[PDB]
Every structure is written in C-alpha cells, then in structure tokens.
Amino acid sequence: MQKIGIYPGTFDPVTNGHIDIIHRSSELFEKLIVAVAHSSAKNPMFSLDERLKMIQLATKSFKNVECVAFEGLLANLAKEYHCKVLVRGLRVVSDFEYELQMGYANKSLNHELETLYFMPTLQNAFISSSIVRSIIAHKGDASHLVPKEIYPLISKA
Amino acid sequence: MQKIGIYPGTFDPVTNGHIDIIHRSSELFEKLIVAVAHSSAKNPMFSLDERLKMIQLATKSFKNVECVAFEGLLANLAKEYHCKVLVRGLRVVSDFEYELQMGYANKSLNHELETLYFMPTLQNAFISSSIVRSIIAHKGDASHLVPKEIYPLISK
Amino acid sequence: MQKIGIYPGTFDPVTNGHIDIIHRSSELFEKLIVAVAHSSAKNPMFSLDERLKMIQLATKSFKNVECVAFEGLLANLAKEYHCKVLVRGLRVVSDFEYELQMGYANKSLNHELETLYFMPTLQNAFISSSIVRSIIAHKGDASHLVPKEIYPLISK
Amino acid sequence: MQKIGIYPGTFDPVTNGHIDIIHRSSELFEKLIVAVAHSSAKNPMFSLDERLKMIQLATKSFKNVECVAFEGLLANLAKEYHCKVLVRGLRVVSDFEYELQMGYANKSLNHELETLYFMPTLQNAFISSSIVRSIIAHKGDASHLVPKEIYPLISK
Amino acid sequence: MQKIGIYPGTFDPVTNGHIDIIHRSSELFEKLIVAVAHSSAKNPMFSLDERLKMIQLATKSFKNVECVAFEGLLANLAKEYHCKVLVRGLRVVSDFEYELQMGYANKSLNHELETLYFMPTLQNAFISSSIVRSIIAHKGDASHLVPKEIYPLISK
Amino acid sequence: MQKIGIYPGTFDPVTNGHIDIIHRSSELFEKLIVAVAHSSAKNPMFSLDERLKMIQLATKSFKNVECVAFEGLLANLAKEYHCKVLVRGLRVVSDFEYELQMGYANKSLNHELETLYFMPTLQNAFISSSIVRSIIAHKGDASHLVPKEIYPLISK
Ligand SMILES: CC(C)(COP(=O)(O)OP(=O)(O)OC[C@H]1O[C@@H](n2cnc3c(N)ncnc32)[C@H](O)[C@@H]1OP(=O)(O)O)[C@@H](O)C(=O)NCCC(=O)NCCS
Numbered sequence: 001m002q003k004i005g006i007y008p009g010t011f012d013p014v015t016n017g018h019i020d021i022i023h024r025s026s027e028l029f030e031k032l033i034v035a036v037a038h039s040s041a042k043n044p045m046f047s048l049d050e051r052l053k054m055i056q057l058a059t060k061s062f063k064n065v066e067c068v069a070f071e072g073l074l075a076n077l078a079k080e081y082h083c084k085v086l087v088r089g090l091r092v093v094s095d096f097e098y099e100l101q102m103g104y105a106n107k108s109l110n111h112e113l114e115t116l117y118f119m120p121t122l123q124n125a126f127i128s129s130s131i132v133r134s135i136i137a138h139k140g141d142a143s144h145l146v147p148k149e150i151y152p153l154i155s156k157a
Numbered sequence: 158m159q160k161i162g163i164y165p166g167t168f169d170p171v172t173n174g175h176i177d178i179i180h181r182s183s184e185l186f187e188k189l190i191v192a193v194a195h196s197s198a199k200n201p202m203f204s205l206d207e208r209l210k211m212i213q214l215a216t217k218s219f220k221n222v223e224c225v226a227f228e229g230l231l232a233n234l235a236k237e238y239h240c241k242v243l244v245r246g247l248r249v250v251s252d253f254e255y256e257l258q259m260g261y262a263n264k265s266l267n268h269e270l271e272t273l274y275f276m277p278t279l280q281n282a283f284i285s286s287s288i289v290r291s292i293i294a295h296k297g298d299a300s301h302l303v304p305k306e307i308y309p310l311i312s313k
Numbered sequence: 314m315q316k317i318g319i320y321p322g323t324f325d326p327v328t329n330g331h332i333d334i335i336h337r338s339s340e341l342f343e344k345l346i347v348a349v350a351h352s353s354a355k356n357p358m359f360s361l362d363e364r365l366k367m368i369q370l371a372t373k374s375f376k377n378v379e380c381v382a383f384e385g386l387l388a389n390l391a392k393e394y395h396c397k398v399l400v401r402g403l404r405v406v407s408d409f410e411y412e413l414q415m416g417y418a419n420k421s422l423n424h425e426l427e428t429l430y431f432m433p434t435l436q437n438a439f440i441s442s443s444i445v446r447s448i449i450a451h452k453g454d455a456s457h458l459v460p461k462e463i464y465p466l467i468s469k
Numbered sequence: 470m471q472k473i474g475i476y477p478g479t480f481d482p483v484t485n486g487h488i489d490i491i492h493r494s495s496e497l498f499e500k501l502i503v504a505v506a507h508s509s510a511k512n513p514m515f516s517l518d519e520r521l522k523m524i525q526l527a528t529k530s531f532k533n534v535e536c537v538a539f540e541g542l543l544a545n546l547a548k549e550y551h552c553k554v555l556v557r558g559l560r561v562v563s564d565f566e567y568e569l570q571m572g573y574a575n576k577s578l579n580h581e582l583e584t585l586y587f588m589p590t591l592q593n594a595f596i597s598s599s600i601v602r603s604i605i606a607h608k609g610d611a612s613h614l615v616p617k618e619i620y621p622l623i624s625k
Numbered sequence: 626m627q628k629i630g631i632y633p634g635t636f637d638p639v640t641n642g643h644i645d646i647i648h649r650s651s652e653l654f655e656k657l658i659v660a661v662a663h664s665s666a667k668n669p670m671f672s673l674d675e676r677l678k679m680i681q682l683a684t685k686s687f688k689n690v691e692c693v694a695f696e697g698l699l700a701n702l703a704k705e706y707h708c709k710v711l712v713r714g715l716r717v718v719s720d721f722e723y724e725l726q727m728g729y730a731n732k733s734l735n736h737e738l739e740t741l742y743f744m745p746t747l748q749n750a751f752i753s754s755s756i757v758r759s760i761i762a763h764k765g766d767a768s769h770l771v772p773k774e775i776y777p778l779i780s781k
Numbered sequence: 782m783q784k785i786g787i788y789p790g791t792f793d794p795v796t797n798g799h800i801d802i803i804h805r806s807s808e809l810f811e812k813l814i815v816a817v818a819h820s821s822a823k824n825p826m827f828s829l830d831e832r833l834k835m836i837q838l839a840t841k842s843f844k845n846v847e848c849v850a851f852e853g854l855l856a857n858l859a860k861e862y863h864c865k866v867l868v869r870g871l872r873v874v875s876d877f878e879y880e881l882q883m884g885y886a887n888k889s890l891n892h893e894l895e896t897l898y899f900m901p902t903l904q905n906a907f908i909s910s911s912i913v914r915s916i917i918a919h920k921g922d923a924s925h926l927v928p929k930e931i932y933p934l935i936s937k
C-alpha cells in the first residue's frame with residue numbers, strides 16, 4: 001500500500017496548498033504520482049501542458065514525485081500504476097460530503113482503490129486555485145499563493 | 158395531500174438513488190407524478206426527450222407513477238395537477254439548506270404547496286447523476302449506478 | 314404507509330415548530346401518534362408526565378392525533394403500532410447528517426421502518442426547545458415560541 | 470473604521486435580502502458604498518449598467534449610501550476609498566467557510582481590510598438572487614422578492 | 626448603533642481568538658462591553674469571578690473596552706446599555722446556523738437588537754476555549770493559545 | 782511517517798466503523814497503535830479497562846496492531862512512541878471542521894505530528910458509538926454494529 005500513491009487534481013494552477021499535500025504525502029509513499037487531469041468540462045484557465053509543466057517544476061525538489069497528465073478515469077489510471085491509494089487534501093473549504101462521495105465512487109470503479117486525506121499547513125488552509133485565478137484575472141498580485149518559480153508564467157498567461 | 162405527490166428533477170440521467178425515492182414515495186401517495194424539468198440553465202448531458210424516455214422506462218413497474226416533462230414553474234405545475242406536495246430526496250451530498258430555501262420559495266409561489274423528504278437506501282446515499290455523467294463522459298462503466306432499463310441508452 | 318405515522322421527540326417543551334410538524338403530518342396520515350420519549354439521558358427540564366400533558370393540551374384540536382409516552386426503542390414502538398413511517402421535522406439548525414444516520418439506524422432495527430421529513434413554517438424555522446428552556450431558566454418571556462395552551466404550565 | 474464601509478456584490482438583481490443588509494450597515498457607517506462588481510466570470514442575467522441602475526433606484530431613500538460599479542479588485546477599490554471594512558450578508562444558504570476564505574483573501578490583498586457580517590431579517594433569510602433569476606427565467610412573478618423600484622425594470 | 630457594542634461569552638478561558646474579536650470590534654464601536662455570562666448550564670472550568678478577572682487582565686490595553694459579568698438574559702443587559710448591537714466572532718468551527726438562530730432569538734426578545742459578526746486572524750481561526758481546557762486538564766502547555774497575562778492563572 | 786501510526790479514540794464501544802479504519806490503516810503502516818483515551822470528561826458508558834479489553838479482542842487478527850490505554854495528552858503519547866502520524870476516520874457524521882481544528886491543535890503541541898484520514902466502508906459510514914450506546918441502553922440488539930467478539934461484553 002505504501003509503495004505508491006496518486007495525488008490527482010486539475011491544478012489550475014498549482015498552489016502553495018497543493019505543494020503542502022505533495023510534501024507530506026511524498027514523505028509517506030515510496031513513490032508519489034501527481035496526476036494532472038485534463039478536466040475539459042471545467043474550463044481550466046491554464047492548458048493541460050502549462051498545468052503539467054508548472055507542477056513538474058514546482059515538485060523538482062521532491063525526488064520520489066513524478067507528475068503525469070491523464071485523460072481517462074482516475075480509477076483506471078490507478079490500475080495501470082498498480083496503485084491502491086488516492087491521496088486528497090482536506091482544507092477548510094473542502095466539500096467533505098463530496099469527498100466521501102468521490103471516494104466511494106472511485107472504489108466502486110476499482111474495488112482495491114482507497115482514498116487517504118492529508119491536511120495542508122494552517123497558513124494554507126484557506127488557499128484555493130479559484131482565488132488565484134480571480135486575483136490574476138483582475139490583474140492583482142497572487143504571488144503569495146503559489147510557488148515563486150511559476151508565478152511569472154501565471155501572472156502573464 | 159395523500160392523493161398526489163410530484164417528484165421533480167432534471168434526471169440527467171435517472172439513477173438508482175432517484176428510483177429508491179420513487180419506490181418509497183409511490184408507496185405513500187395514491188398517484189405519483191415524476192416531473193422532468195427542462196433545466197436548460199443547467200446544461201444537461203441528455204435532452205429533455207431522452208430524459209423523459211429514460212424515466213418512463215425506469216418506472217414502468219410502478220403502476221401508480223406517471224412521468225411528465227415540464228417547461229415552466231414547478232409551483233404552477235403543482236397547481237395544474239391540483240397537488241399540494243412536492244417530493245424530494247435527502248442524500249449525503251444533498252445541500253440541506255438549499256432544499257429548505259427551495260421549499261420556502263415554492264411555497265411563496267404557491268401557498269398550499271408543501272415539500273416532503275424521503276431517504277434513498279443506504280447503499281445509494283452517495284450516488285449522484287453527476288457521477289454517472291463523469292463516468293459516461295470518460296467512456297467508463299456506470300451500469301452499477303442506474304436502472305438496467307436505461308443503460309443501453311446512456312452507454313452507446 | 315399512509316395508515317399511521319409516528320412523530321417522536323423529547324418535546325421539552327413542545328414548541329410552535331413541533332406543532333407545525335404535527336399540523337402537516339396529521340394532514341398526511343390517517344392516524345398520527347405523537348410519541349414522547351422519556352429521554353432520561355438528556356436531562357429534561359420537564360418531567361415525562363409534564364411533557365405528555367403539555368403536548369396533549371397543544372394537540373387537542375387535531376382529531377386524529379394521539380399522544381403517548383414511551384420508555385423503550387422507537388423501532389419497537391413502531392412495530393407495536395404496525396407503523397412503517399417515522400415523521401421528523403427539518404429546521405435550519407437540524408443536523409442533517411445525524412438525521413440520516415438515525416433514519417438508517419432505525420431501519421436497521423426494524424426493516425420496514427422509513428423516515429419521512431416535513432418542514433415547519435418559515436417564521437418557525439429557527440425555533441428550538443433549547444431556546445425556550447434558556448429563556449425560562451432566565452425568567453424571561455417565551456410565550457412567542459410555544460402554543461398558548463401550555464404557557465401557564467411552563468411559566469412558573 | 471466607522472467612516473466608510475463597502476458592501477460589494479454582483480446584485481443580479483438586488484433583492485429584499487440585500488436591501489436589509491444595506492439598511493443595517495448604512496445605520497452603522499457614516500457612508501456606505503454599495504459596490505456592484507462586473508462579475509463577467511459569473512454570467513449575470515442583467516448587464517453591469519442595469520444592475521447599477523436597479524440598486525441606485527432601490528437605495529434612493531438611504532441618504533448616506535452611494536452606489537458605484539467596479540471592474541477591478543475589490544481590495545484595491547477599498548484602498549481607493551480609504552475603506553478598512555467590507556460589509557457582507559449572512560443568510561441561511563450562505564457558504565460560511567467560503568465567506569471566511571474570501572475575507573482572508575481580501576486581507577492578504579489589502580492588509581487593512583476587515584470583513585464584517587450582518588444578517589437580513591428572518592423573513593428574508595432564505596431569499597437569493599438565483600431564485601429571482603429562476604422565477605424570471607420561467608416567466609413567473611418575483612415581485613415579492615425584490616424592491617418595488619426595480620420591478621418595472623426587471624420586466625424589460 | 627456605532628456608540629456601543631456588547632461582545633458576550635462564557636470566556637472559559639479567554640483565548641487569543643476572543644482577543645482578536647475584541648481588538649476588531651473595539652476599533653469599530655465608541656465603547657465595547659465584554660459581557661461574561663455565568664453559563665451555569667455549561668459547567669465552566671473557571672468560576673465567573675476567575676473568568677471576569679482573566680478577561681479584565683487580557684483587555685487592560687484596550688482603553689474603550691469594559692468587562693462585566695451578568696446573570697440573566699443578554700437581551701435585557703443590552704437594554705440597560707441602550708445597546709443595539711451584539712458582537713459575535715465567526716471562526717472555522719463556528720456553528721453557523723446556530724449563530725443565525727441565536728441572533729433571531731435575541732431579536733425576538735429585544736426588537737432593537739442586531740447581531741454583527743467579526744473574524745479573528747487566520748492564525749487563530751481554529752482556536753477554541755474547549756481546546757485550551759483539554760490541554761490544561763491534561764497538564765499540557767496551552768501558552769500559545771491564550772493571552773500571556775492569563776497563563777500563570779490557568780496553568781497546570 | 783510510514784513506520785508507525787497511532788489511531789486514538791474513546792472507543793465507547795469500538796464499532797464496525799472503527800474496525801474498518803484499523804483494517805485500512807494497519808495495511809498502510811508497519812505498526813499501528815490503537816490508543817484508547819480515558820476521556821473521563823465524556824463520562825463513557827464503559828470503563829477504560831473495559832474499552833481497552835474490547836479493542837484488544839476486536840484487533841486480535843491484526844498482527845501489527847497493539848492497543849494501549851492512555852491518560853495524558855495524545856501529542857505526548859505520539860512523542861513517547863517516536864510516532865509522527867495520527868490516524869483518524871472520516872464518516873458521514875464527522876465534524877469535519879472540528880477534525881481540522883484538532884489536527885492543528887495536535888501539531889501545535891507536537892510540531893512534527895501530522896494527522897491522516899481514512900474512510901470506513903460505505904456500509905459502515907453511518908455507524909457511531911453513540912448509536913450503539915442508545916440501543917444497548919434500551920436492551921436492544923446492537924450485534925449488527927460491533928465486532929461479534931465484543932458483543933457479549935456490551936449486551937445489556
Ligand atoms: C481531477 C479530479 C481528481 C478532481 O480534482 P480537482 O478538480 O483538482 O479537485 P476538486 O475538483 O475536488 O477541487 C476543486 C478546487 O479545489 C481547489 N484546490 C484543491 N485542493 C487545493 C489545495 N490543496 N490548495 C489550493 N487549492 C486547492 C481549487 O479551487 C480546485 O480546483 P478548481 O477551482 O480549478 O476547480 C476528478 O475530477 C477526477 O478524478 N477526474 C478524472 C475523471 C474521473 O475519474 N472522474 C470520475 C471520478 S469519480
């Protein structure tokens with residue numbers, strides 16, 4: 001179980017909160033896969049390539065982390081990695097009942113697939129990518145919310 | 158009030174959860190109208206025609222259930238059916254406060270109109286249409302979440 | 314299902330909110346049994362006998378309502394009455410998840426026992442027994458919160 | 470801190486709920502700015518121009534209230550007004566943790582900017598702009614939910 | 626409205642979270658009364674005398690804050706102060722609906738009496754008195770959670 | 782983080798939902814400590830000795846689980862075990878915000894101590910110790926809710 005975990009997300013863009021989750025979960029698992037969903041139906045501000053490349057650079061210090069993009073069902077991705085554990089973060093604004101729902105849905109699609117939750121640091125408990133998008137969209141400074149190495153890209157496009 | 162209840166929804170698509178509510182409410186009421194709203198403002202995956210068809214197929218075994226599509230205000234539909242009871246389901250991910258809000262909003266539009274709530278079976282307390290749509294959209298198998306009568310129509 | 318419903322509670326004391334629920338639910342069932350639980354674990358301000366007497370007085374107008382006191386499990390009381398429906402009220406401050414939990418727990422105890430939920434009037438959506446108790450405990454006036462027929466009993 | 474507060478919103482349209490908040494908050498502050506955001510990412514039914522006009526008409530009676538439209542960051546708008554307090558309304562369907570989140574986001578953007586919350590009257594605690602939009606969109610009568618001064622302008 | 630606000634509480638003991646609310650609300654009102662309730666129905670850890678002394682010490686730096694103890698209804702205390710505003714804090718674990726309930730209950734007891742809500746600092750958004758008590762009862766170090774001037778009075 | 786985790790609780794009594802959490806977490810960690818707190822403030826139905834005995838019987842099959850009782854701070858227990866991970870379960874009726882609050886409180890007492898959460902099986906998502914207590918208090922059959930090996934120890 002501890003061999004591999006998958007942390008899925010849209011990551012639009014990657015925030016300091018997501019990095020907290022990566023930090024703690026990469027400590028626990030021998031390998032952590034960060035799985036960047038296309039999420040076409042949401043209308044992500046950043047392209048799948050931009051999102052993947054940003055999270056790849058932001059996770060360069062974590063040597064047991066690999067970031068990948070995926071287009072299909074997360075439950076199937078887990079099967080292809082022989083992974084029995086999805087990693088999720090729980091923040092103040094998490095929809096807790098929706099997380100339980102998604103956990104059970106994923107298990108119903110892949111009977112071996114458990115979901116485990118981590119907390120970000122307290123300072124990041126109220127950060128969300130939607131807040132970063134809103135600030136950027138209104139030409140404000142969101143540098144306090146994201147890894148500095150990706151901020152110039154997002155502050156532009 | 159026991160003569161007729163209306164169970165409204167977008168039913169995009171109808172799920173095992175909705176069928177549980179239909180089963181339970183149809184036992185209570187002499188007549189149950191299952192009322193499929195256009196809900197154009199949501200951008201439903203399935204057309205109104207498709208969603209009505211699916212609910213008709215799924216409710217064939219309930220002798221006292223009639224399915225209708227409607228385009229206007231639910232509160233007016235209730236008046237048309239001389240119905241004073243809306244039927245809603247409460248699940249885990251229900252937005253409880255929003256249900257209260259909608260209940261009072263409907264009663265403001267139609268002063269006779271009460272809202273009553275049923276629970277699905279425990280096994281179905283986490284199912285949503287949204288989940289079925291996500292699975293469908295990613296070409297996966299959602300047959301465990303919807304009545305067998307509709308699966309050919311949603312899968313291919 | 315439609316023959317008999319049971320509305321259980323501690324009713325410490327009965328409030329205008331509880332009456333709203335009795336009003337709507339007694340419209341729905343042929344017989345509504347208002348069941349007052351001893352609730353020894355909670356530490357009710359009013360004795361079982363006082364709480365029964367107050368809900369009897371408050372429900373005298375509703376001809377098909379019978380108020381009883383009970384000591385045991387509700388799921389068993391429903392069995393005795395050949396009742397398949399528990400009535401609950403959903404207010405602003407209801408613990409929605411706890412209601413679902415209780416509904417499933419009662420079904421686990423009595424496999425035929427469903428739980429159905431009604432809403433009080435909007436004006437009463439924020440009333441609770443605990444608020445009445447707090448006001449009484451501080452010698453204030455709770456007359457705006459409870460049926461006129463019980464007020465001389467709770468005000469002492 | 471007393472000098473000026475900003476009550477921001479999409480106001481699509483202004484409702485009786487919003488007016489309660491304006492009434493209460495305009496009693497507190499020497500000046501209240503009602504700030505109507507463009508909110509393009511949301512897809513407002515009424516244009517920024519119409520929304521500003523409706524809230525101006527609706528607030529004419531409050532002499533210390535001024536309505537303005539804005540396109541940029543609220544935290545910057547506050548800086549422009551030398552305003553240290555954002556005014557928000559808390560209703561039954563309010564997303565409480567989302568309010569705390571936005572309050573903290575605004576404080577990150579402008580270190581002097583606090584958020585204070587008011588409640589509408591109980592009768593308006595379940596009103597929302599989306600309810601008014603839904604009723605309008607289904608050709609219904611939403612006059613009971615909005616100030617009379619906007620109601621001819623809501624029917625264009 | 627702007628002249629005086631009352632911030633009521635059990636303050637068992639006062640925490641850094643409460644002090645944030647006192648800091649924010651005292652910047653708004655000409656006078657802020659910190660009103661320490663007996664709250665006998667809680668069985669508070671610290672006596673009313675202890676809780677009043679602690680909050681008095683922790684608030685000595687706020688020149689326009691006065692702390693008092695009170696035994697009966699808050700809505701009546703507000704009348705003695707000709708106060709139209711109760712001050713409450715909203716933190717992460719606040720029971721949002723219970724706050725609305727209590728605000729409407731207070732207004733029903735004193736028709737002039739509004740409730741306004743402030744937020745503590747982010748770093749204090751998860752502190753509660755109950756955590757302090759648990760830590761102290763287990764003889765642990767809660768000095769990071771309460772004002773430094775009270776720590777020697779609560780510790781071990 | 783992977784070498785040891787501690788799953789704390791009052792376990793009054795241990796239920797099928799707690800065993801799901803034990804099963805999943807003992808699969809993840811090399812060693813799991815199940816730590817039964819005195820929790821005298823909660824006035825448990827079962828004594829600390831009884832609750833420890835029950836969780837011992839119920840965890841016999843998990844070869845890498847050890848159960849202990851503890852009287853002091855959990856944050857210190859974790860330091861005493863060279864453990865930096867607390868294990869918690871998330872169920873339908875979990876107080877989500879309260880869990881986050883406790884997670885941060887424990888980290889503030891022990892700066893290396895993280896909290897991780899697991900989910901029980903869906904069938905057990907609505908089980909609580911409080912339900913089991915209510916049923917057994919009324920001499921009901923709670924055998925469907927708890928491990929068969931402890932049932933004689935809680936019956937009656
Ligand atoms: C990708 C997937 C895991 C959802 O991931 P997600 O969108 O990032 O996570 P959620 O949707 O639950 O969270 C939404 C928001 O939380 C915020 N975000 C999440 N965690 C955060 C944190 N740690 N810090 C800061 N922001 C965070 C952002 O606002 C975020 O995204 P958004 O605003 O761009 O939508 C899910 O849709 C999926 O598995 N898709 C694949 C298809 C599939 O298998 N579907 C069926 C699943 S049952």
Ligand SMILES: CC(C)(COP(=O)(O)OP(=O)(O)OC[C@H]1O[C@@H](n2cnc3c(N)ncnc32)[C@H](O)[C@@H]1OP(=O)(O)O)[C@@H](O)C(=O)NCCC(=O)NCCS
Nearest residue numbers: 165166167169172174175194230231246262284285286287
């Ligand atoms: C149709 C109407 C009743 C809403 O019904 P609804 O869409 O099914 O219910 P909600 O919008 O509250 O949310 C339902 C969602 O919960 C889930 N759903 C509801 N109950 C479910 C159950 N028992 N099992 C599985 N899924 C369920 C689905 O995800 C569902 O669909 P969605 O993802 O397509 O939105 C309402 O919009 C309406 O009355 N419209 C007509 C116009 C009108 O009168 N408007 C004014 C109303 S005040």
Ligand SMILES: CC(C)(COP(=O)(O)OP(=O)(O)OC[C@H]1O[C@@H](n2cnc3c(N)ncnc32)[C@H](O)[C@@H]1OP(=O)(O)O)[C@@H](O)C(=O)NCCC(=O)NCCS
Nearest residue numbers: 321322323325328330331350386387402418440441442443
């Ligand atoms: C009696 C029983 C139904 C609970 O009823 P209850 O105590 O009135 O309802 P809840 O416990 O869910 O809490 C309701 C609270 O809301 C308030 N109340 C409830 N509905 C209200 C309404 N519509 N308007 C105003 N106040 C209301 C009261 O404050 C009340 O409790 P309080 O006296 O402790 O303050 C339940 O304990 C029971 O079934 N006991 C019998 C034994 C049993 O079967 N146990 C196992 C059950 S699974």
Ligand SMILES: CC(C)(COP(=O)(O)OP(=O)(O)OC[C@H]1O[C@@H](n2cnc3c(N)ncnc32)[C@H](O)[C@@H]1OP(=O)(O)O)[C@@H](O)C(=O)NCCC(=O)NCCS
Nearest residue numbers: 477478479480484486487506542543558574596597598599
């Ligand atoms: C405008 C802004 C304040 C949001 O305000 P809002 O849209 O009115 O309020 P919210 O988005 O939080 O959602 C509340 C909804 O309920 C309505 N509502 C709020 N109070 C209400 C009340 N008292 N009665 C009835 N309806 C009410 C709102 O108008 C809104 O309706 P809608 O989305 O259906 O149109 C925010 O988006 C903003 O500050 N924008 C400026 C750009 C910016 O600075 N962004 C970064 C912010 S951190």
Ligand SMILES: CC(C)(COP(=O)(O)OP(=O)(O)OC[C@H]1O[C@@H](n2cnc3c(N)ncnc32)[C@H](O)[C@@H]1OP(=O)(O)O)[C@@H](O)C(=O)NCCC(=O)NCCS
Nearest residue numbers: 633634635637640642643662698699714730752753754755
């Ligand atoms: C005193 C009174 C205001 C309640 O205030 P309170 O006890 O502090 O606040 P609540 O009871 O609503 O909940 C507060 C809990 O939050 C936490 N606390 C509250 N705000 C906090 C903050 N900002 N930071 C840290 N901890 C806080 C504590 O855990 C706390 O108290 P507790 O653990 O001692 O119970 C109310 O009971 C009252 O008005 N009593 C007087 C009699 C009366 O008028 N009754 C009728 C009222 S309608």
Ligand SMILES: CC(C)(COP(=O)(O)OP(=O)(O)OC[C@H]1O[C@@H](n2cnc3c(N)ncnc32)[C@H](O)[C@@H]1OP(=O)(O)O)[C@@H](O)C(=O)NCCC(=O)NCCS
Nearest residue numbers: 789790791793796798799818854855870886908909910911
């Ligand atoms: C023991 C401690 C972990 C709390 O654990 P707990 O009592 O089991 O968990 P909570 O108090 O958060 O709530 C548990 C309740 O949920 C239910 N329960 C919890 N998980 C459950 C599960 N998976 N299945 C069924 N029931 C469960 C029960 O109703 C339960 O017990 P209760 O009715 O006896 O209160 C905590 O009080 C503690 O750490 N105490 C030690 C002293 C200390 O360090 N205090 C400072 C902590 S910051």
